Scaffold this active site. Sequence first.
Site, mmCIF file in Angstrom:
data_model
loop_
_atom_site.group_PDB
_atom_site.id
_atom_site.type_symbol
_atom_site.label_atom_id
_atom_site.label_comp_id
_atom_site.label_asym_id
_atom_site.label_seq_id
_atom_site.Cartn_x
_atom_site.Cartn_y
_atom_site.Cartn_z
ATOM 1 N N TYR A 84 -0.388 -4.785 -6.490
ATOM 2 C CA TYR A 84 -0.237 -5.256 -5.111
ATOM 3 C C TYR A 84 -1.640 -5.434 -4.512
ATOM 4 C CZ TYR A 84 0.148 -5.490 -0.113
ATOM 5 O OH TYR A 84 -0.054 -5.887 1.179
ATOM 6 N N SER B 162 -1.267 -3.109 11.362
ATOM 7 C CA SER B 162 -0.515 -3.922 10.462
ATOM 8 C C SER B 162 0.870 -4.213 11.087
ATOM 9 C CB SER B 162 -0.426 -3.294 9.075
ATOM 10 O OG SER B 162 -1.639 -2.636 8.714
ATOM 11 N N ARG C 117 3.519 -12.009 1.007
ATOM 12 C CA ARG C 117 2.313 -12.594 1.543
ATOM 13 C C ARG C 117 1.912 -13.881 0.907
ATOM 14 N NH1 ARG C 117 -0.864 -9.020 5.163
ATOM 15 N NH2 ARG C 117 0.284 -7.027 5.055
ATOM 16 N N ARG D 102 0.831 -1.181 0.000
ATOM 17 C CA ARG D 102 0.000 0.000 0.000
ATOM 18 C C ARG D 102 0.875 1.244 0.000
ATOM 19 N NH1 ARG D 102 -1.938 1.039 4.221
ATOM 20 N NH2 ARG D 102 -1.223 -0.707 5.550
ATOM 21 N N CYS E 288 1.601 -6.248 13.516
ATOM 22 C CA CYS E 288 1.588 -6.344 14.977
ATOM 23 C C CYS E 288 0.906 -7.626 15.459
ATOM 24 C CB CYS E 288 0.871 -5.093 15.591
ATOM 25 S SG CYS E 288 1.910 -3.655 15.437
ATOM 26 N N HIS F 48 -10.665 -3.233 11.383
ATOM 27 C CA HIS F 48 -9.414 -3.941 11.125
ATOM 28 C C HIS F 48 -9.144 -4.879 12.259
ATOM 29 C CE1 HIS F 48 -4.853 -3.462 9.929
ATOM 30 N NE2 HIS F 48 -5.441 -4.528 9.443
ATOM 31 N N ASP G 88 -8.395 -10.475 9.768
ATOM 32 C CA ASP G 88 -8.049 -9.105 9.344
ATOM 33 C C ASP G 88 -9.165 -8.054 9.307
ATOM 34 O OD1 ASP G 88 -5.651 -7.288 8.029
ATOM 35 O OD2 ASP G 88 -7.213 -7.255 6.628
ATOM 36 N N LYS H 39 -9.202 -4.045 1.368
ATOM 37 C CA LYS H 39 -9.093 -2.841 2.247
ATOM 38 C C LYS H 39 -10.032 -1.718 1.723
ATOM 39 C CE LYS H 39 -5.948 -4.412 5.031
ATOM 40 N NZ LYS H 39 -6.012 -4.650 6.485
HETATM 41 N N1 LIG Z 1 7.136 -10.831 20.263
HETATM 42 C C1 LIG Z 1 5.981 -11.219 19.665
HETATM 43 N N2 LIG Z 1 5.917 -10.938 18.345
HETATM 44 C C2 LIG Z 1 4.738 -11.350 17.776
HETATM 45 C C3 LIG Z 1 3.662 -11.959 18.508
HETATM 46 N N3 LIG Z 1 2.678 -12.214 17.640
HETATM 47 C C4 LIG Z 1 3.121 -11.794 16.447
HETATM 48 N N4 LIG Z 1 4.341 -11.210 16.517
HETATM 49 C C5 LIG Z 1 5.115 -10.575 15.447
HETATM 50 O O1 LIG Z 1 4.172 -9.908 14.578
HETATM 51 C C6 LIG Z 1 4.682 -9.981 13.247
HETATM 52 C C7 LIG Z 1 3.693 -10.711 12.343
HETATM 53 O O2 LIG Z 1 2.486 -9.952 12.240
HETATM 54 P P1 LIG Z 1 1.801 -9.604 10.838
HETATM 55 O O3 LIG Z 1 1.281 -10.832 10.236
HETATM 56 O O4 LIG Z 1 2.764 -8.701 10.133
HETATM 57 O O5 LIG Z 1 0.659 -8.758 11.532
HETATM 58 P P2 LIG Z 1 -0.883 -8.515 11.106
HETATM 59 O O6 LIG Z 1 -1.469 -7.787 12.217
HETATM 60 O O7 LIG Z 1 -1.614 -9.775 10.758
HETATM 61 O O8 LIG Z 1 -0.719 -7.574 9.844
HETATM 62 P P3 LIG Z 1 -1.642 -7.265 8.497
HETATM 63 O O9 LIG Z 1 -1.890 -8.585 7.881
HETATM 64 O O10 LIG Z 1 -0.662 -6.443 7.719
HETATM 65 O O11 LIG Z 1 -2.875 -6.476 8.950
HETATM 66 C C8 LIG Z 1 6.004 -10.720 13.319
HETATM 67 O O12 LIG Z 1 7.046 -9.739 13.528
HETATM 68 C C9 LIG Z 1 5.809 -11.534 14.542
HETATM 69 O O13 LIG Z 1 7.006 -12.045 15.136
HETATM 70 C C10 LIG Z 1 3.872 -12.217 19.892
HETATM 71 O O14 LIG Z 1 3.006 -12.776 20.555
HETATM 72 N N5 LIG Z 1 5.036 -11.796 20.405
HETATM 73 O O1 LIG Z 2 -1.592 -3.470 5.521
HETATM 74 C C1 LIG Z 2 -2.564 -4.220 6.000
HETATM 75 O O2 LIG Z 2 -3.055 -4.227 7.205
HETATM 76 C C2 LIG Z 2 -2.925 -5.404 5.146
HETATM 77 N N1 LIG Z 2 -3.463 -6.404 5.820
HETATM 78 C C3 LIG Z 2 -3.808 -7.579 5.333
HETATM 79 C C4 LIG Z 2 -3.562 -7.795 3.986
HETATM 80 C C5 LIG Z 2 -3.025 -6.778 3.209
HETATM 81 C C6 LIG Z 2 -2.712 -5.569 3.782
HETATM 82 S S1 LIG Z 2 -2.158 -4.318 2.684
HETATM 83 MN MN LIG Z 3 -2.441 -10.429 8.845
HETATM 84 MN MN LIG Z 4 -4.434 -5.727 7.739
#
Ligand SMILES: Nc1nc2c(ncn2[C@@H]2O[C@H](COP(=O)(O)OP(=O)(O)OP(=O)(O)O)[C@@H](O)[C@H]2O)c(=O)[nH]1
Ligand SMILES: O=C(O)c1ncccc1S
Ligand SMILES: [Mn+2]
Ligand SMILES: [Mn+2]
Length: 614
Positions: free
Chosen positions: A237, A288, A404, A89, A290, A266, A313, A246
């Site tokens: 993307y 995102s 992804r 994005r 987190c 979200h 999500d 989104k």
């Molecule tokens: N230390 C720690 N890190 C975590 C935990 N859960 C997830 N993470 C970290 O979070 C990140 C993965 O999260 P993403 O899949 O990017 O997060 P998301 O919220 O699903 O993001 P979007 O799909 O972009 O909305 C990696 O850096 C992981 O290691 C946790 O319980 N502890």
């Molecule tokens: O940035 C985001 O949160 C995101 N989350 C899930 C899948 C794609 C995106 S762009």
């Molecule tokens: Mn995710």
């Molecule tokens: Mn997301």
Amino acid sequence: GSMPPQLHNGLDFSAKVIQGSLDSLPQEVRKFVEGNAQLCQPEYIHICDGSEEEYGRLLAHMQEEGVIRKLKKYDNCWLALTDPRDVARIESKTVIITQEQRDTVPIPKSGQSQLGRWMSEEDFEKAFNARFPGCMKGRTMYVIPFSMGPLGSPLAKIGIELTDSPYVVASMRIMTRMGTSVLEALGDGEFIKCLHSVGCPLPLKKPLVNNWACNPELTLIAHLPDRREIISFGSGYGGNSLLGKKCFALRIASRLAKEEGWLAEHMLILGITNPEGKKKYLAAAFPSACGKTNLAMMNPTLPGWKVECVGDDIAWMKFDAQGNLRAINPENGFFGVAPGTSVKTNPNAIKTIQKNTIFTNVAETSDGGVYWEGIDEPLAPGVTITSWKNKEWRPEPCAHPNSRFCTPASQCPIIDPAWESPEGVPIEGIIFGGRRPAGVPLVYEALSWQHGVFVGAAMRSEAGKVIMHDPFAMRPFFGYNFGKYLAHWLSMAHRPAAKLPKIFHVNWFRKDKNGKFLWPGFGENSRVLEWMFGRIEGEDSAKLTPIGYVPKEDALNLKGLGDVNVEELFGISKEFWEKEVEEIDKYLEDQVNADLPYEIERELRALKQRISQM
Ligand SMILES: Nc1nc2c(ncn2[C@@H]2O[C@H](COP(=O)(O)OP(=O)(O)OP(=O)(O)O)[C@@H](O)[C@H]2O)c(=O)[nH]1
Ligand SMILES: O=C(O)c1ncccc1S
Ligand SMILES: [Mn+2]
Ligand SMILES: [Mn+2]
Ligand SMILES: [Mn+2]
Ligand code: NA
């Protein structure tokens, strides 16, 4: 619909239809398709039916062209590598069009709004005219009829996406419910008009990089809520091109939600069952990057507990006539960050993604497998790695950090049995959280609904490190004025009957002085969920602090975790929180300004006061 009259032969596109029929489309759907065909000038029109045959041949075609590669180690899995200019994005090229700016973002007191990007109608018309005319020349326009949500759910909404990208068609089949049954469901009803082009009409004016059509310089992701339109140009993307993901899911839907009395957020949705066979659904909004997808798919470490995934999500939530907050996952798959996904961090994703999955921008192993940073598992001697940049690679990362997987939800071995129930699931808790290396304890509970909305509003997260504001995890996704979104959330308390969920805030990311995580996280977060569960049931397991309730001493199950420093992990410093409240104050005053609800200002005052008494 009916054929347009014409004095010549340029308005009726019937002769260019290679699948389906314009005559069989609902009238407004034909008008939408044919109107944009007249504008974009595709060579062909393909009305998608959503069949397996269609999907299979489309994939084989992309394979023919070298747009995707088959991952032969797995069952019907595929890999796309993009132009490195088109990998995520682009907030600064994402806009919302309304007649008045204030309907889109609050007018900030001193600064530039961080809560949206308004574009005027006039500026958009000019931008649109500089992009779309002729943009699909030489290409197929695919017509993707799709439902956000289970088909016929009272909470579902329908769109029609036109695209020149077969990648988008394939990925939309995963991420939405698409095809002929949706057209039949739709009939003469309303739908969101979604128009997408990669912006590369043939013959190509510029070199194609990695067989990935895009136009970075003219990339523009626009939302016109008062016209029920999403118009996206220049990017393939998925966040920019799968217009359900989104654009519809959050931006247009949050506005619909505002108008219609519901919430589009979200948030993951999970079901958790305890050892006494009681089950509760929770939703959680983290920014995102987190960890929502990890939580949504958690493999809990506590014996006798079960977690099942509704979605990872997006949540669409509406109080029913009985006062329950009923939620659906409006998606059909997971579009999940690959790097960092391992058997330690998300074993259930590892399971899910080895069939019928499309990967974008990950590395490829010489035996036709996938690789990424943090996969945390070795390759046999002999096996080599091609990076996401299509180069031989050995320890730059081998995968893009926002690469992804795009996988069917129905394949998740812990998919919830009600994940497609059209009435949705009843949410009993809402969790906020982000990355806070200092100051913020592992878990707390809001004091009231109003406090909890303030907690959402006050969310911050680490991006030297920068701690950014990301209210409700919605900062890049608000479909309308955030202040008005706060008021909408607050208004839920005045619905008679409403059963307001408990609101919690978590922090998986607190670090000690050496920069090490205080909390092991992942499956161990099941112990935090257990505490939340009991709190929802009314357990006397909390103690009051200035920021809200936290677990009593001994309330959290720490069996296994004597290594864990509850003291530093749950520490609350006056000095930290004095600074925290000041930053939240400054942020809300500037960025929400005249649209900040009274209740939110009041909660700010109250938190300030409680901290002052420490
Ligand atoms: N230390 C720690 N890190 C975590 C935990 N859960 C997830 N993470 C970290 O979070 C990140 C993965 O999260 P993403 O899949 O990017 O997060 P998301 O919220 O699903 O993001 P979007 O799909 O972009 O909305 C990696 O850096 C992981 O290691 C946790 O319980 N502890
Ligand atoms: O940035 C985001 O949160 C995101 N989350 C899930 C899948 C794609 C995106 S762009
Ligand atoms: Mn995710
Ligand atoms: Mn997301
Ligand atoms: Mn109120
Ligand atoms: Na490619």
